[PDB]
Amino acid sequence: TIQNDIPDLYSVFKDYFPIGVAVDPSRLNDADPHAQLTAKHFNMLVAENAMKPESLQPTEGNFTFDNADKIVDYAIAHNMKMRGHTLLWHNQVPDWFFQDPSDPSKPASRDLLLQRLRTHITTVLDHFKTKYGSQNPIIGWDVVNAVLDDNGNLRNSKWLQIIGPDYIEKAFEYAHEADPSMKLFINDYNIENNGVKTQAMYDLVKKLKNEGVPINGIGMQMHISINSNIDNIKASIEKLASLGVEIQVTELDMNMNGDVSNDALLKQARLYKQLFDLFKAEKQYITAVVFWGVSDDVSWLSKPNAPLLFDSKLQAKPAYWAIV
Numbered sequence: 001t002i003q004n005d006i007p008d009l010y011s012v013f014k015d016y017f018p019i020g021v022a023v024d025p026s027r028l029n030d031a032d033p034h035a036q037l038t039a040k041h042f043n044m045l046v047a048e049n050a051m052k053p054e055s056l057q058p059t060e061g062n063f064t065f066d067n068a069d070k071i072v073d074y075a076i077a078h079n080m081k082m083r084g085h086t087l088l089w090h091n092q093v094p095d096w097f098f099q100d101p102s103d104p105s106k107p108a109s110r111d112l113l114l115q116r117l118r119t120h121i122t123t124v125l126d127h128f129k130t131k132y133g134s135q136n137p138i139i140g141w142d143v144v145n146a147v148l149d150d151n152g153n154l155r156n157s158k159w160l161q162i163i164g165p166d167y168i169e170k171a172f173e174y175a176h177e178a179d180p181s182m183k184l185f186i187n188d189y190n191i192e193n194n195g196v197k198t199q200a201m202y203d204l205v206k207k208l209k210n211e212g213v214p215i216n217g218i219g220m221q222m223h224i225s226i227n228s229n230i231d232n233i234k235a236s237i238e239k240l241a242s243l244g245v246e247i248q249v250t251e252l253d254m255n256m257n258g259d260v261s262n263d264a265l266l267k268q269a270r271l272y273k274q275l276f277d278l279f280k281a282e283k284q285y286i287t288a289v290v291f292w293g294v295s296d297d298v299s300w301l302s303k304p305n306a307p308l309l310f311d312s313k314l315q316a317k318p319a320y321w322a323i324v
């Protein structure tokens with residue numbers, strides 16, 4: 001059971017930006033405590049998995065939008081906005097995309113993979129536009145996800161192998177043509193550490209935007225840890241924001257590195273407080289902050305963990321009170 005009388009999390013940030021959460025379609029029933037927590041504290045939703053490529057087109061031409069639509073319906077019912085995650089990634093994408101259909105032992109050509117990407121992106125965006133119309137809660141999409149490797153080079157996924165470096169520009173082009181009302185984002189992790197990957201994201205977006213690619217913003221996943229440096233996060237936000245794009249904190253959670261002790265929870269609270277003070281200070285750039293999971297018990301991180309503001313019993317943690 002949840003705490004019904006404590007402050008609604010997102011309301012505390014009404015003058016800064018919406019506060020969202022990533023959800024599972026199986027946790028949306030009115031009597032489900034996770035759903036109650038979702039509707040109470042957030043005014044933005046994201047599909048943790050239901051809108052990924054494999055979740056939308058498991059086999060070629062066979063689109064499965066039921067779970068995604070269930071989340072969209074829920075968002076509409078609770079007056080929540082949504083982020084679309086994600087049109088392209090190297091994980092949770094079916095092998096068929098990259099295979100020659102007449103000889104699955106061979107790879108698809110650059111033209112065939114591009115056509116498939118175009119069809120996927122266009123069908124996905126057209127689905128939400130045609131089914132929901134003006135009521136579509138999705139305000140933007142992570143057009144490409146995690147396209148950089150640890151060293152800042154372009155990740156050598158099958159997309160890069162088969163098409164080449166311009167597959168990124170093509171994805172944005174296809175999304176923009178399908179629905180110009182959508183804000184288009186390039187999303188990634190570790191770009192908040194002000195290291196080589198932050199610089200690489202900055203260089204890539206600067207290059208593409210200067211070439212006319214319709215990139216509207218950068219999503220900083222923010223899968224931080226109990227040892228993350230606030231100064232580096234601030235420097236990263238400033239650097240990326242200098243490109244004239246929106247910044248959204250898209251998959252916020254805190255890896256405790258196995259230490260879920262009471263002392264660690266207090267340290268977590270202090271860090272989350274500093275983090276949100278930073279976000280508020282940077283409100284002229286940040287247009288959304290989304291947590292990757294409703295509560296600790298449903299977090300994607302391996303156990304033991306305590307990454308969010310609500311614990312495994314769905315109760316507000318010290319971090320929640322520090323921020324509110």
Ligand SMILES: O[C@@H]1[C@@H](O)[C@H](O[C@@H]2CO[C@@H](O[C@@H]3CO[C@@H](O)[C@H](O)[C@H]3O)[C@H](O)[C@H]2O)OC[C@H]1O
Pocket residue numbers: 048049145146189221251300
């Ligand atoms: O942007 C990335 C996120 O999308 C990513 O989210 C996690 C992706 O893996 C999910 O776990 C899979 C769910 O589907 C099952 O069939 C698989 O067996 C699981 O591995 C997890 O639920 C998401 O939270 O996190 C990393 C980000 O870079």
